[PDB]
Amino acid sequence: MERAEILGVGTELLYGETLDTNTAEIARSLKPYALKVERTLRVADEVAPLAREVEEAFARARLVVLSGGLGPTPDDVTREAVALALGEPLELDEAVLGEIEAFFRARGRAMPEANRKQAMRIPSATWLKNPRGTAPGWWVRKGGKDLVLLPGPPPEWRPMWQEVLPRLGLPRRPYAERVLKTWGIGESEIVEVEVGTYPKVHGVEVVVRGREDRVAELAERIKKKLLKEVWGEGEMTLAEAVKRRMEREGATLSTMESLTGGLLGAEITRVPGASRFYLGGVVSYSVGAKARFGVPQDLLSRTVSAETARAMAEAARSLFGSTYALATTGVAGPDPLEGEPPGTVYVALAGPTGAEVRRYRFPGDRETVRLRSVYAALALLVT
Amino acid sequence: MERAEILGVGTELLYGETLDTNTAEIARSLKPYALKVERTLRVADEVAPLAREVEEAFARARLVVLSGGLGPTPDDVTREAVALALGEPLELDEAVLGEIEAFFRARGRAMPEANRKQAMRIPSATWLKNPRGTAPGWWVRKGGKDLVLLPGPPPEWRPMWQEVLPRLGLPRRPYAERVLKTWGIGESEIVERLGPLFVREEEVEVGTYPKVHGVEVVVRGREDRVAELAERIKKKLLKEVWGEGEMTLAEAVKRRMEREGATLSTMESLTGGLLGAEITRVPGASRFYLGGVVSYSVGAKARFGVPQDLLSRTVSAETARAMAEAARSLFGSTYALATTGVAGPDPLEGEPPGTVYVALAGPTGAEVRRYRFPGDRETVRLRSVYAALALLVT
Ligand code: NA
């Protein structure tokens, strides 16, 4: 089996100032292909060491993928390092220049001198169009091997890489993964090709991976064994599950939040099409705010309670006129509140036939508790 | 300046099934020493590729550090690979084999035969004690070079590494670094402004890192060069620098509210509550943040004060101003932030994705800033959050 070599470029990656997920993510995209990944690299922003690593990686590999260092500054030196590794001169493409120029003009700017170098390429390189940035990528086909240069930011490289990957003509292998996403059941209970369990803030994922035939058969048997706990598969998320229920019913949604601070509204609206059902929300972070939008005076001294969660959901529902409304209240941490520890949370749903509350006691730090709270609220609608 | 190579062993680190933070953490620990980290590797659990990588890393470096693959599984092959790469045989340390039996004996169990592996060392290796797990590591000194094998789990390796590092005899170099966080200025403009201040040399280097929260500028290297150079750069970037070091925008906004005795509220469209979420990330937000509304539908925009004539152009500077002034009046806060715009993937009101207006209303009036952010939907949302926060700290 031939090798794929994957290099992330950036000194800040070495030190984990920015965490290298790009190389990992590209390696994962390569599993359906019959290439071996023996190693991945993160390389500092220096021309000579980078050219050496690129030269060596290309020498031993069917495929080399580089990610990062395509910006306009003196620390972006990937194009120079690759040209040096392949013994080709860099040459300015006037058509690409016009396009960078147009990119800046739309934004009401003139094109800075330093961006000119992003329109440079070696003669062996075909351009990869960057739909979201000024630096197009490269695709070098040479001696039966492929070298691909990609931008560092994921919104640029993801669409680029999806487009070019099939075109590389790599040998395929029948690998697959199936992800079953559950809620409200611990790892231990679940236990009662390879099958793994993965605890996340949105619930425990059951992952089945390996030979596509065996993945297919096995995954069906497991989903059956976990039929009521499974809320979605693959790319499905709780927010998207909510959106599907809302559109099915022609229903609307609104929210009132305290400890989640607006994170619940943020997670609902993350999904395209949220405007078809989501009317809006209130972040009632102070006592004054809670009263002003409908929570009864009698409850304002006991905010960490089932009664308050219920009252907040009712108040949001009457304020927005939505079919359904979700509310969050409780203790995110680090401090206790009203004698209750961090991770003490009540989520509530108000709908046509009344309200329901669930209490949770969530482990984790402040941000973790906020996240688990957001997903517990969405789970009221889809579990 | 001599090289330090750092290898993380484990096939799952490649695919990010376990996030590799060990190599970066080892790399940071090397900062006070005059060694160059040109690269770090993650290597699969396979003896021949690993031996090759170790062999190459050791030939080019003053120091090689390996992390992981010291267990009892067939997939734990680091000891072998190193023995192979360095041209020395694996030798069984009887005592160590004892210590390992004691580990299992203190748990009610007899030692599995698999764990026998863990008592092999090469002649060049002296042991590094692991009182917190099964496998001890190695310190190998050879040809004036050092090679170290560390266990994978951090509670195990951190103490070990902390004890052996000051014994390696590495050249020392007084190190400093300075991180400047800017907003409202692109990388190309920073390059032009800094000119020859954008030094990249062996003694000291300047780097720029574009983030959703603005361009970060880092100066690192020799302590005596870093202070002065960083200061000159700060001077050139003065009005655009909002924080240093560990500082975050949300923390910066918290400092200004506490300093003034002032309160804050928000009104959000495209960000959907993400601005309030970011503000309340910081412990102690309730001392100043009164709350906010997410006016996602047209009906909710009108309910919370957006003028009816503006509802055909919610993506505009006039609307942003109106939103910020409405939240201010509605919550009685000293300040209010607003966001309005087009997240993507579709246009809205004829305006393309990335079109964003953020506004701030306060005691002396209101102001609005306009942006055309590239990125996907989640990116534009995030940029808008930080753009709104930057209004209060410029
Ligand atoms: Na880049």
Numbering used by the authors:
A (entry chain B): 1 to 192, 204 to 394
B (entry chain A): 1 to 394
How is this structure described in the published paper?
Here we describe the determination of the crystal structure of CinA from T. thermophilus (TtCinA), which contains both the NMN deamidase and COG1058 domains and is therefore a bifunctional enzyme. In addition, we show that TtCinA adopts a three-domain structure, with a third, previously unidentified, KH-type domain between the NMN deamidase and COG1058 domains. We demonstrate that TtCinA adopts an asymmetric dimer and present structures with NCN, ADP-ribose, AMP, and ATP bound, which provide experimental validation for the modes of substrate binding proposed previously. We use these structures to propose models for both enzymatic activities and suggest that large scale movement of the COG1058 domains is linked to ADPR catalysis as well as providing a rationale for the usual asymmetric arrangement of the TtCinA dimer.
The complete structure forms a dimer, with an overall oval shape. It was readily apparent that each chain comprises three, not two, domains; the third domain sits between the NMN deamidase (NMD) and COG1058 domains. It forms a KH-type fold, with two α-helices packed against a three-stranded β-sheet (referred to hereafter as the “KH domain”). Most strikingly, the TtCinA dimer is asymmetric; the NMD and KH domains are related by a common 2-fold symmetry axis, which runs horizontally along the main axis of the complex. These two domains superpose between the two chains with a root mean square deviation of 1.1 Å. The KH and NMD domains of chain A form a buried surface area of 815 Å2 with the COG1058 domain of chain B, whereas the value for the inverse, i.e. the KH/NMD of chain B contacting COG1058 of chain A, is 57 Å2 (calculations were performed using PISA). Critically, the asymmetry in contacts made by the COG1058 domain results in a difference in the environments of the ADPR active sites on each chain (discussed further below). The formation of a TtCinA dimer in the crystal was corroborated by measurement of molecular mass by size exclusion chromatography, which gave a value of ∼72 kDa, close to the predicted value of 86 kDa expected for a dimer (not shown).
